[PDB]
Each structure stands twice: as C-alpha cells, then as structure tokens.
Amino acid sequence: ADYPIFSQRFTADPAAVVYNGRLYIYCSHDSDATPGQSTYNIPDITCISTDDLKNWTDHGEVFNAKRDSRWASVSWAPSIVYRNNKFYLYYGNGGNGIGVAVSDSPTGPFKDPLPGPLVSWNTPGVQPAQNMWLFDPGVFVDDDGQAYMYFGGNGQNNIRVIKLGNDMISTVGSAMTMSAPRFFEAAYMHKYNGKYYFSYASDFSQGASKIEYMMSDKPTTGFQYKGVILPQPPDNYSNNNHHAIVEYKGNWYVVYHNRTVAKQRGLDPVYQRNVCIDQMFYNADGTIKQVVPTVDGLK
Template sequence: MLAAALSAPSCAGPLDAPGSSTGGGQGGSAEGTTVSTGGASTASAAVSTTGGAVSTTTTGGVDATGGGGGGGGAPPGVANGYARNPIVSHIFTADPSAHVFEGRVYIYASHDPDDQSGYSMVDYHVFSSDDLVNWQDHGVALAAADTWARYLYAPDCCYSEANGKYYLYFPDSGSGIGVAVSDTPGGPFKEALGKALISKSTPGVGDVDWLFDPTCFIDDDGQAYLYFGGGPTGTGDNARVIRLGRDMISLADASATTIKAPAFFEASFMHKRDGKYYFSYSTDFTGHAAYIDYMMSDNPMTGFTYAGTILPSPADNNGDNNHHSIVEYQGNWYIFFHNRVLAKRDGFSNYQRSITVDNLMYDAQGKIVQVSATKGRVAQLKSVNARARMEAETMAAQRGIEVDVVQEGGARAGVAVGWINDKDWIGYSQLDFGGGVESFHARVSSGSTAGGSIEVLLGGCEGFTDSPGERIGVCEVGPTGGWQAWTDVECAAQVPPGVHDICLRFTGSGSDPLLNLDYFQFK
C-alpha cells in the first residue's frame, strides 16, 4: 500500500512494505527523567522528501544556527533537560562509536533488526546532536547490499583533514574489515575497495580469531591508526593495531602489531588525553560479565600498561556483550555504550540493543574514574531555537514512529518521519521560544484516505515528561494525493516566552498510517 506509492528505493534497497519489520520502533524513553508508556515495534517508514528535501548533513537537525533565543538577537534560553537514555528508541542500535565532526557529536552504530535471533545486522545508521539530548537520525549510512560484506558488525569513522573525506571502517561479521568513504559525516558512504582492507592474509593477523570491531584514531601529527580484533577466552592475544596510509584506504605497515591486553575479548577503542593514549576494550566473561577495561601508554602502538575498569556490565544489559566509545565535547568527556533496556522492557531478546550515554571523569593522575553503569544523567548542553527549521527525525524520545531514507531520481533525497499511527508521539527537549510564538508550521504528506491530526503539546506528554502537557494547537492534515505529495500546513499554537519541552502527538481513525512529517518550525 504505502510502499507501492514510492517508486524510489532507500539506500538499503526497496522500502519495506507494511508488515515487514526491519526497524525496531520503540516507545518512549526508558531511563532518565521520565517513564515510558511503552510502544510496539513497527515496520520502517514509507516516506519521501519530494518537494521538501531534508539535509543529511550538519546543516539540518537541532538548531544548526547555533542556539536558541527565538530570533530578534536575544541570547539563547538556558536548557534544563537531560538525555532520555537510551538516546535512540525508534530502532535498536548497538556498538556506538562517537566522534566530534563539524561541531556535533556523531554516533556510528550497528542496527539490530527487530526479529534477529543472532547477530545478522545488515546496515548502519548515523546519529548526531549538538545538545546530547535531541538526536538526529541521518538514515542508513551504509548497507551490506552495497558492499562485498554479508553482515555489518560494529563500525567506526575518521575524518582525514588531508583528504577532506570521511572514512567508515566496517567488518564483515568477524572475517575481515572494509572501508567506505563519504563527503559528509552523516553519509551515505560508498564502499571504496571492493574487497577487505584487513583479511586473514594481512601480515600479523593470521592468528586473530575475529577480524572485526575496527576503531580508527588519527593522532595530532595526522597519522591514522586502525585497531581491531577479538576472540574467545584462551585463544591468545587477539588485539591488533596497524598504521593506515595517507589515503586512509591502504596500510602503511608491513605487519600488524599485537597489543597484549588482559582478558581482551572485543570492542577496541582509542582516545588521547593530555599526551596519554588510552586503549580501551571489552573483557571476556571470566569471573564476571563483560567489562570495559583500559590500558595507558605514551605511544599509540606499544608500551601499554593495564589501568583498570572503566565500565562494569551496564544496568539492564542482562550480563551480555559490552561495547563503548569515549569522546570529549565542549570541554566535557562522555562514554557511549549499549544495553538491553528496551528489549527487556518490551519483550525482545538479547539480540536487540540500545545505545546510551553517561558522563566520564578523570582523577588528578589522569586515571579514568569508574562509571557506575546504572542510569546516567547527562545534562542538555543548550536549548533549541524553536523558530528555526527543525527536522522531525531529530528527537529526544518517541513512541511508535519510524524514519527512512529515500531516493528520488536516483539520488538520496533525505530523511523524514513516517509510519505515523494514531496515538504515536515525538518528544523534543527544551525548545527556546524567545518572547513567544503564535503558530506551528509543518511539511507533511499523506497517502491515506482520511489523513490525520498533529497535536502540539506544551510541556511534554505522557511517556516523555512527568506531566501530560497542555494541548495548544491542532494541525489537520488531509490526504495530499500520495505519500510523496508534500505540502505545508499551519495552525495557531500560542507558546509563552521561555524554554519548554514540546510533544507532537498524532491522532486519526483506523489502524493504517496517517501521515508523514518532514520538518517543522514555530513562528
């Protein structure tokens, strides 16, 4: 029905027809400041951005203009929000690799299908934020169908200043590591070699059990390194590092170097602070569930000394695998990792994971203070300009919706929210309305026979905030002639001055999808 209205396929192939489930649409936040009301899994969205293309670069998303203020030159309002851990809830995500690109935190993540009963991931999504609470889904960044790989496990990304390109390193399960390239941090990425960059034939890796979990690190002098490897308990030293060529798609060393890390299992990561190199990784399960431990050195390849545990097995992780990344942003350090909190809540299996964020601290000696691995409380860094265009897929929490990437005329058009049903909602944290606004404007489409309504709720909504919110406006969306036929709607929505949480709640009759939502703004 909906998919038939779309002639262009997504980056992962034809858009999923109703009833298929690749997405992992979940309900609401599960931790943080609110309690979720739940939400069943849904299929991925049938959307298009015809007539209103969404940027998949940093020009879109949350307040790309750099602050709130609501216009008029006023200073931005102060945000008083917190990350709704897990930070992504509309699909299942894992293995987060966080980096700062173009002034935003970008996360490169595995995508767990709703129905997988093993690890059979076939695409990656990229997420970004400049406030650590509202996260934009840039859609599918790379699909296995567009590479030589069968399954796509934990990825990582680096930016080469010398080349002006972004490089995504991806493993084919545990059998080899490839590389893809893009002009933008959000992708899409194009496979670069047509074969593995790291394989069993690479000198120095023949005895590594699992050739996966690559992490890319570029030092201050511009030299790039690739860390990788993994293996079961008792199979020897499986951690490796090798220098990358200047082109980022070749190897500069004749052989990989072994890193001897105690109880090393998988999930290598490297970061640098005050001249020290921190090699962190997931331990095996000897004596406890998988921990994130680390070593320190004055050299990025050798001389590492064990330093301790960063993160025990996270809360609601069911004692299963562990994967992380560490990043500095705006003067503070953060750790990203995954758990099974949504899967546990909604009755899925251990193969459906969700990414979360917590604060990271160092002591006076440069050692990492162990993270509690419970429910972190990460503060929102800034408010969002409510008068600026806001991509609908940039959200703090949601119930029931999906996003999708579509192509138009053979080119990627953008990302929008779709598969919106009655009682679904999206929560946006700490929007700055300056001196107040009077109306709500949105770019929408609807291929349904009746359309639906967008309710604007001030102060949040049930499942997103402690209070149910106050309905301040309703925009009616009638049939637009197809899911690709976009139009603009507006309605009165008086919002008082200041910074407020906002929910968009969708209503309509029947069980079929009501409408698609591209972007919105207040005036």
C-alpha cells in the same frame, strides 16, 4: 535529557565523532528479531546526532554492506574518523574481513571504494593467530599524522594494530601484535594529555564483560593495565558490552549500549540493544574514573 536516548530501531556498538558543532553516533543496526535468529543480524549502520545532548536526530542507516560494498554482507561495530574533510567508516564483515566506507557527509551515503577488505586474514602480521576474531576496528589518528587501526578479538594476545595511509583506505606495512588482560572485543584508542588509552571489552572469565583499559606513553607498545571504565550497565542481561570515548564541548563521554528498550517492551534482548551515553571523568594522575551509568538522562 531523555533515557533511553533513541528507541526507534535497535542500536549497538557505538562510535562517535564531532563535526560542525554536532556529536554524531554511528551504531551497529540490530535488525528487529526474526524467528529462528541465533546470531547477529547487523546489515547496516545507524547514525544519530545532537547539538545539545537533548534532541537526537535520526539520520537513518547511512551504510548498508550489501548495497554499498562490492564484497561485504554485514557491517558490525563501526569506527568513524573525520580526516581530509571526509568521513571514514570502518566496519567488520562478520569476522570475514574489515572494510572502509567513505562519504563527504557525516550522514552518507557511505560507499566502500575497495574490491575487498582493507584488512583480511592475509594481511601481513595478522597470522599466526589462533581463535582470533578479525573484527571490531578502532581507528585513531596521532599527532604525527600517522593513523592506526586496532582490531581483533577473543584472547589476550589477539589484538592487532596496523598503520593506515594518509588516504585512510590503504594499509602501510605489517600488523603488529598487542596484548591486554582478558581481551575479548571492542578495541579502542584515544589520546589525552600525552597518554594513549587502549580500551576494550573483557571476556567472561571472571564475571560478565566490562570495559577495561591500559595506558602508555606510546601508541602500540608500553601499555600497562589500569582498571575498569564501565561495568555491566543496567538492563544488560549479563551480555556483551561495547563502547567509544569521545570529547565534546570540553567534556568527555562514554557511548555504549544496553538492553533497556527490549526490556521495557518484553522483547528478546540478546540481539536487540540500544545506545547509551554517560559522562566520563579523569583523575588527576590521568587514569579514568569508573563511569556511573545513569537512567534519568544526562545531567
């Protein structure tokens, strides 16, 4: 297998879904660097896929916020869900609302059907929030058929979770607050063997951001911190760290990003990331073993 897996264009903040025997990864498309750039330039979402964890097919950019929504300008940090035989791609409009785009195909075109954000600063239960980043959705569908969107940023108590309707393009009720030590961004939920795993990127307060996690018997309460899933990957310049956890063909993987492509090309790595993948394992007690980044391809 190759490392890096995909270098055609820069990619970050992956999310993944399995459909018809393939693993699809959706990423923030980090636009090629421009002179004067001093923040993100993520206008669209890239999708790649595989059926063998060796050959990755480039599906291009499958969602563009300006082209494919009526209200959004950017599309940061996608979350993908397959439900109702449709694909729901949630995205952050740069902190200015969270959207949802829909397609009958994993590879789009995705289109946001709504006149405005799915979740906004005015959504009940979001505020009060001081210094929150209203972004970085992580959507999950529980065994009982209830979907949840986790989101937020920039503080221990700046996580929110809200129910989504079964149509996946509406909210139900109010958002509620969660807390996780040193929470910074990248909220993510998955369930395994009766446990809920809230994973996230930590802040820069005791070193560089790590992917850390909590476990609970419940989806929105009852969490306890359990440790680190992913340290800083190699070739990451002590910068941001963003992941997804996914099961594919009976094994588990963490998809994430680093800056190895930019490093090899001598390019500015801050906003020129590339997707990565590594295997993840569970301990017998259900905790997650810390992932070991690899640089010579999946084994």
